[model samples]
Target: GTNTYYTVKSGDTLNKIAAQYGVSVANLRSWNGISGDLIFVGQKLIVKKGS
Candidate 1:
């Protein structure tokens, strides 16, 4: 599966990060194994999940 990753930083939200990558929060959640808004800083997240 192809995937795109994004770096998260302070003040970053799912609305911003996910949207910035042409995706939705729902896609970002399972892609990064996230269950909520709580995301770790300095960690890479899968923005595009082969779509």
Candidate 2:
């Protein structure tokens, strides 16, 4: 998992992150252990490579 930081912007969503990174929403959730699509402005996420 290559560590890549992604800053959350307005209109950003979990599904959007997954789609942008070629990952699945479930994978993003599992990676971050998120139970919901809750995200905040300026929140940073670690999006790994080949995830």
Candidate 3:
């Protein structure tokens, strides 16, 4: 349940993705080098858990 690599799909948001994976938005931001909550479809993201 850790070290996940999820691909971003249409309609996917960091908040939604983090919620589904039980991870924090900040975790996704830091792990994926995200800023301004901006993201692109089909871009893979590292869903690495903080704990």
Candidate 4:
């Protein structure tokens, strides 16, 4: 299966990325096992699952 991923960039925030991907910040954290909103540059995040 394929998956949607986002690479963390400068000025990137969980809310910002979540909005861009059409998913909730909570979901983003759930999907990626993130405990907090903190994310750093070069971090890889799973945005969605692809068929």
Colliding residue pairs in candidate 3: none
Give lDDT per model, in order: 0.72, 0.71, 0.76, 0.77
What is the TM-score of each predicted model, taking all chains together? 0.65, 0.67, 0.70, 0.71
Clashes of each: 0, 0, 0, 0
| Candidate 4: worst-modelled 10 consecutive residues by lDDT | 9-18
Question: Which one wins on TM-score?
Answer: 4
Q: Every model's Cα RMSD, please?
A: 2.2, 2.0, 2.6, 2.2
Model 4 has an lDDT value of: 0.77
- Candidate 2 structure quality by residue, lDDT tens digits, 1-51: 377667877647877767866777776677677877787658787667563
Evaluated against the true structure, the overall lDDT of model 1 is 0.72
Deviation (Å) of 36 in candidate 3: 2.5
lDDT, residue 37, candidate 1: 72
**TM-score quality measure for candidate 3:** 0.70
Q: Candidate 3 — which residues are off by over 4 angstroms?
A: none
lDDT of 2 at 26: 75
Better of 2 and 4 by TM-score: 4
lDDT of 1 by residue, 1-51 (tens): 766676786637777666665677786787688887776677777776655
Clashing residue pairs, backbone N/CA/C < 3 A, model 1: none
